[PDB]
């Protein structure tokens, strides 16, 4: 087949949606973490130990992946110029 | 060992990385959009390459992004 700018616009929209949904969940999780700061004392610490481990591992590994995306897209956008 | 404070700074960098990705897709989409008016008269040949490349880049990363959402969502759900 052959690709039109209209076709890419549709895919781009899906990309924005996928990226925005990720942003959404990051904000949701950071809010959760943030709300714990005031009460990070006794039983609270033990209760959320697992979630904290999971959160650290996921966020840490997803950072450079996100950075690879923006780097790739930047270079491609640069090309269009 | 892990505090909400350290998770906060990590989360901050994560927000930044995702935000920068969203910035670049906005850039690229703006470029695509601008091509539509002069498309019919343009010479597609020299655009084919970057079209194919940009299509691949987006298509391969969309499901990765969605997976990230679903994973973070499950984690944030444990918080309820």
């Amino acid at each position: 087949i052959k690709i039109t700018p209209e076709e890419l616009e549709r895919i781009a929209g899906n990309f924005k949606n996928a990226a925005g949904e990720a942003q959404s969940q990051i904000n949701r999780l950071e809010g959760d973490i943030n709300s714990l700061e005031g009460q990070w004392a006794g039983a609270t610490q033990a209760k959320f130990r697992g979630e904290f481990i999971q959160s650290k591992q996921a966020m840490q590994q997803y950072i450079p992946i996100l950075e690879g995306i923006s780097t790739d897209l930047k270079r491609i956008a640069d090309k269009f110029r």
Side-chain angles (χ1 to χ4, degrees), chain A residues 46-63:
Chain A
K47 181 177 184 172
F48 286 104
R49 178 212 275 215
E51 291 84 340
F52 273 25
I53 293 297
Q54 287 186 254
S55 300
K56 176 172 182 185
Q57 163 66 22
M59 291 192 300
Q60 276 193 325
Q61 292 306 115
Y62 287 153
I63 306 312

Side-chain angles (χ1 to χ4, degrees), chain A residues 8 14 28 31-33 38 43 64-65 69-70 75:
Chain A
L8 296 182
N14 289 153
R28 183 183 163 213
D32 291 341
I33 270 59
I65 296 181
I69 290 184
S70 68
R75 93 203 192 177

